[PDB]
Design a binder for these strands. Structure first.
Lengths: 624, 623, 624
RNA sequence: ACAUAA
């Protein structure tokens, strides 16, 4: 057992007591909150051509005393919060796995106890790091993770639930050894850039303390890593022969500025088909996947070398240039608000729907699956249909990626949403075409549609993604040179080192999500990416302001209405019906929502004026 | 952008603005309702050995787009109306794909806006037609689709939501070029056959105008179709050799009138195993699927030739003869109503269950709006268990066929259901054996069980399925001659051209669903099929009336009861309990439902008089 | 149609009317309850290397069960009672299938009619027996199944629903010909061992009458069995060669008493890898699976010969000795009750949670609340996470095994649970490590956690699993000699003949589930297993009593609290809000649930005293 | 999933 002191917080790490059959296991306790995390990794190579890594974080509300809420008295499905926490843990540990580790791996988090004071999600990230550190699973150095808040202008490490509710910042930092950053995930109440930057360095300092404690625990209990059957990386001489075959053709494709997404992919694919058959002849004994990956390595190396050497991008832009941005509002007459935001070849359609306040309380008690209530009655739903990439896929349910992107754009817009709006605000963002940051375009399109709908948001919100291309030492691994790219394409994210999504107002930052693919990047690079994104965000907000700069003076004429209808006591039974049958039927066939307010009063919400015309007729005849 | 005028309605069709990465995309707008449809087809052939076409129609709200529901899709899946709409779109476009197009294809419909006036489902069919027409996907001519209603004796094209509520007909027609009919789907309020036939004529005329508009847009855009890597139709050389090997043996099997479903299939399989073996030595380099398909082509051709040349079906009857029909009611004492309907080797057991009127709502706004509320508190649930065909299959959840057949049978029985019935009527139809139209047997069996249960239906309802065998010009494509078959077997549906299911009373038509495998059929064939089915329906109703001709004078004595109990205000808190705890505990230990009526009255619904008795003991002791 | 008389009850068996396409089909009727069961078996061998047998028992409609709203919810619409009934039917028929019958087989039970007096579950078991008997599916001998109850001291066969509500025993017996026992499943109200043993004898006698009737129907119908194209069992001469290769190595492994679960599995695996190489060279034309099964047959035979000949087990125990047992209570401060039970290498962590009566047995929708009520407001949720065996698996939804084990451990504890407890009691058992009977460990750990939580249970409950190894000559099929093993390891269950799990207090039996893998066992063996398990149970209760012997005098001070708040009529509208919106909001942010009990008073339930503080603050400002 | 002697 090891105790780590983080200011006034205490972190207790232990292992060797519970779940001793798993490859790795750890208990991380803070206060009276304890989280057990286990890691399992198969020894037989996975048939998949990548590393299959799954992280599952289960709330298990028996640890809080509030699990059995439905008719089965048992959880059904996984909530939004569980999915989001699973993604944060996944982003914190995925970069540190060695390349070619194609082995099925599962990290599971079990909430032994929660005291309602210390949040278990941060403990779970540290638990995953300890469990992997103590296991025989090949995994690079320990990761420390903290949450940083700002309460009354003071930086607080791992704030309690009470403090998180008074905090203008919710930043989660995962650090690797030598003060590298592997994961950043923030939502802020439109705070200044300098304040945001200081919280990052305070957070990274704390993660080094956790890493020191985990290293002591690893040393105390001897850890011997397994030797995998093999690491699936292409042979060096095969890769360099691929370079001989396809360097010039790939270079020509990547310096052709007339390509669009599809034509560039087809041109690269044309070289791949010719090269691959030549590789098979030269190395008939090579793995078929080894042939495929060697081309991908060469294509990635050529692609990055052009950006590093010539400071020019595959579409002709320089490092700080945006794609073409086109906006337009008032798509359709019946929508409460709408907008179509285009950023390069990325097209996003955003819709705003006003709903009743009563429709925003879908939680554990009301339904088996949904849980929670949004603070401001505001939610964003994000969809990524298969045709946005000319692909075929299942359309039942939502991917974990769709949930994460929706959450990112939701908290990007959340700080500017007004308080005490009469209706529930639902924003739907649909990606019609995608070649880049559709989640950041969902934030820009979201604000346009919100202003078009007449919601008085405090300020317009724009987001952008910053890429990164580095040249590291082949032995030391230190970063010798790097380029930050503004508003990256899909190929620049695929071949890049991070996907640094940040959104905000012209005067502050509201959301950030750094998806780093390297095993950590220095804090200086993160600081510069934030500054570069600040310049890009101003340009985008200037374009958006031309389309619409202030919210419309009122909601659309065909918008929802809320007003009350008086029914007599003698007519209460007739109007309501047996067990509320009449109300539930009128509300089911007209779309309105009737809620009893007093003994005599019923508040009626109608999505359209026509809907209340239908409902008003029914209430009149029923009252007769 | 092309505008098509359909009477007082106007159709706007456009492309090139949204979703430009999809192989094809289109926006169809009528009034303020806009629907965007995309089509994506892979260039790599799929290993499925059939055409993997999937259609997904999705709505972002319920109740005419007034209650947002898209945020709940992760847990609350897709509604029934979405599934039914997807099947109608699928049936309108699937016959027009070329043979051997074994490429994964998906058509997705996105309701950009709905005005609560113009129905988006019809626009989605047209949108799928435009999206395929403008794409590089190999697809035959454009399809136009309209809905025809009848309001005050007037035929209305694409009626609004307000108009549809007053209509006696809900007919959807999809038409191909040259006035061919591709899909028919209707529910009618027991209307005359001639009125029904005129609506089809009116509908087909309007679909031609839509096809004219779509062709103009295609010409302006300049569409060029892809060249698929391979079309998987079997080579004529192998087919001719298969014919030489198996024609005589197949002919003997199909003229043996002693076969049942299983023995005939086994006999054909015996020839297939021997022929498929010999085909390999002759063509060792042929695709193994091509061997399978070549035998299937030959067997289908031999099967049809017998019907065309000799006017005799494979089981010996003539073109208009029904299979043997046996009916039976009141098989189990405790069921509120039951019937066992047999038609050849198709056996369906139908059950009627009375429930409380409050059981038709889900007590939660969003889910209640998602599934809707049935008009007469009447619903039909259709089950097709795997043992009905001696197969093994997943038993939880209903596939798309079960949803479609259930709605078809429910539409057939809906017009005769009385209004203001005291209880919710649930009809359950379970296919115990299948060799044919179990969905139409569900309408007949459902009609018998409703009378056996004492529901005062207006008239008995019977359904039948009409097949079709045609001989077409190989190059011209015109239908030289055809035979209409009454009450087809499964093999006749498999080898046929049409599954024309129609149901009605002795004086009218209540439902229809035409599943056409050909790329359109002439309207004369449709009219003749409707007439031929009317004769068959009369015979079935005569057999049905012998078993039971009128509903029983009252419900069964052991059926549900509804009673009123008075509790004072003083005892009200103790009776209901904390947060209605006692009411729900009683509702779970006896099954009775107690609903407050006013300050003094509680209405008790009990499935059986015994359950009412024990519940009544609970009330008095607690009071 | 054959009628079988069972005391005052009558069984009617029919076939040949419904569902004639199925391989087998039958209708079993008792009173006015009729169940139709069909059996389908493919003639093509399945790719999987075992017998795929699925039993699905479906209630067509409880009251009017109707249909789940959508497709995915339909996959969730299978009730718990349906799953448990499917498992009992599966265990009754699975042992009688021939060895090597690797053909997909589905048994489906359709409830044609239910009179609410006679129970359909036992008719379904008999229906499956008749359907298989009349079918062409090879199936060894009919089984008969009855339920035995004890009403005011009288043994009742197939008691009605009214009788079972007053019974002290719910025992279901499935018998094969010549008085063999195939399935036992019991739930007793802490009854004496001799009373329990007599009910088994009575039940076996009745099952013989049912078998007699089924045999007459089979003979009168004229059944002919199919000839499977292959029975997948290893050929004798390849098993003999495998025995020569690996007898001594396997013998040494199973007599090395230092092995643990993983160490022993690895040692056997090393022999398997070496032996399989030699087997392939000796038999190049052998089926790949035939090689695998030959080693398993040889390994199983060597394993069983040691206990038969030497009366000693692979871990050095003798036949009646338990594994090491350890217990802890009160491991986390915030849990209402907690216990960590360890038995050998099996580790189970049990948690007790209290919640309100309303929020514990009753849901919002009455239609689905049926088959979702608990008599004592008591339920046990059992989890078997994949890391408990160092495996990777999905953690979405309970499988059938987790549902069955949860119901078994709940049955074991149900009779000692007090009536009229102020709260709903939910017990969660998590199997952290698994090397044996975690379900019986869930009963003991559940007992400790219940005592630690302060629930005044009448007596402590312990469970144990009894294994069996028999010696049978193939020329006769009779059991010559046998050994009953106390507290079996996983390997003894895998290589054994039964998994006889029984639980109870120190003076009675509360639950039993015999999972027999043989095609029936004599009653004498069952009787001795019950007695042998009685001795083991007393020893376990002695160890548990040292950790905690009586329930804590009170619940933990940080447990749930219930008290009322007076709300005036004037404040009532503002307090509850429109449609109860304010109360629903409070129940969401805080775990506090407010249920009205009177026109002026509301009952407030708070899971923790801290959560009650927030609720009091919320209601005070609302009151103003 | 979809289509499928239904």
């Amino acid at each position: 057992a090891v105790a780590v002191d983080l200011g006034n917080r205490k972190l207790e790490i232990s292992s060797g007591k519970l779940a001793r059959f798993a490859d790795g296991s750890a208990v991380v306790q803070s206060g009276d909150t304890a989280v057990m995390v286990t890691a399992v990794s198969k020894t037989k190579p996975s048939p998949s051509q990548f590393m299959p890594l799954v992280v599952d974080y289960r709330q298990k509300a028996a640890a809080a005393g509030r699990i059995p809420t439905n008719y089965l008295r048992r959880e059904i499905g996984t909530s939004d919060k569980e999915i989001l926490t699973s993604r944060i843990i996944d982003r914190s540990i995925r970069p540190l796995f060695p390349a070619g580790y194609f082995y099925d791996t599962q990290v599971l988090c079990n909430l032994l106890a929660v005291d309602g004071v210390n949040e278990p999600d941060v403990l779970a990230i540290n638990g995953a790091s300890v469990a992997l550190s103590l296991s025989d699973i090949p995994w690079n150095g320990p990761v420390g993770a903290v949450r940083i808040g700002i309460i009354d202008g003071e930086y607080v490490v791992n704030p309690t639930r009470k403090e998180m509710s008074s905090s203008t910042l919710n930043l989660v930092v995962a650090g690797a050894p030598k003060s590298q950053i592997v994961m950043l995930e923030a939502s802020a109440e439109n705070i200044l850039q300098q304040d945001f930057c200081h919280a990052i360095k305070v957070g990274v300092k704390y993660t080094q303390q956790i890493i020191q404690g985990i290293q002591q625990l690893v040393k105390e209990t001897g850890v011997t890593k397994r030797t995998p059957q093999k690491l699936f990386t292409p042979s060096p001489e095969i890769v360099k022969y691929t370079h001989k075959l396809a360097m010039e053709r790939l270079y020509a494709v990547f310096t052709d500025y007339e390509h669009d997404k599809v034509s560039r992919d087809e041109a690269v694919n044309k070289i791949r088909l010719d090269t691959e058959e030549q590789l098979k002849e030269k190395f008939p004994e090579a793995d078929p996947y080894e042939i495929i990956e060697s081309f991908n390595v060469v294509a990635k190396e050529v692609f990055r070398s052009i950006v590093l050497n010539e400071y020019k991008r595959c579409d002709g832009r320089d490092l700080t240039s945006l794609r073409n941005v086109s906006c337009e509002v008032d798509m359709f007459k019946t929508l409460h608000g709408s907008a179509l935001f285009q950023r390069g070849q990325t097209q996003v359609l955003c819709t705003v729907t006003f709903d009743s306040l009563e429709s925003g309380i879908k939680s554990d008690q009301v339904i088996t699956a949904i849980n929670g209530i949004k603070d401001k009655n505001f939610m964003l739903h994000y969809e990524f249909p298969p045709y946005a990439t000319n692909e075929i896929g299942k359309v039942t349910g939502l991917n974990r990626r769709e949930l994460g992107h929706g959450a990112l754009a939701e908290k990007a817009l959340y700080p500017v949403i007004p308080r005490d709006f009469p209706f529930t605000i639902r924003v739907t963002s649909e990606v019609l075409e995608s070649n880049g940051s559709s989640s950041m375009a969902s934030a820009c399109g979201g604000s346009l549609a919100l202003m078009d709908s007449g919601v008085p948001i405090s300020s317009a919100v724009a987001g952008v993604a910053i890429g990164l291309v580095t040249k590291t030492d082949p032995e030391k691994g230190e970063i010798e040179d790097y380029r930050l790219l503004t508003d990256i394409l899909g190929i620049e994210d695929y071949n890049g080192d991070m996907d640094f999504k940040i959104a905000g107002t012209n005067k502050g930052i509201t959301a950030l999500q750094a998806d780093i693919k390297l095993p950590g990047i220095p804090i200086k690079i993160v600081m510069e990416a934030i500054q570069q994104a600040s310049v890009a965000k101003k340009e985008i907000l200037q374009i958006m302001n031309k389309t619409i700069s202030k919210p419309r003076a009122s909601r659309k004429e065909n918008g929802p209405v809320v007003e009350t209808v008086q029914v007599p006591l003698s007519k209460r039974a007739k109007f309501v019906g047996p067990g509320g049958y009449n109300l539930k039927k009128l509300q089911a066939e007209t779309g309105v929502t009737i809620s009893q307010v007093d003994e005599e009063t019923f508040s009626v919400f109608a999505p359209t004026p026509s809907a209340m015309h239908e409902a008003r007729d029914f209430i009149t005849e029923i009252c007769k």
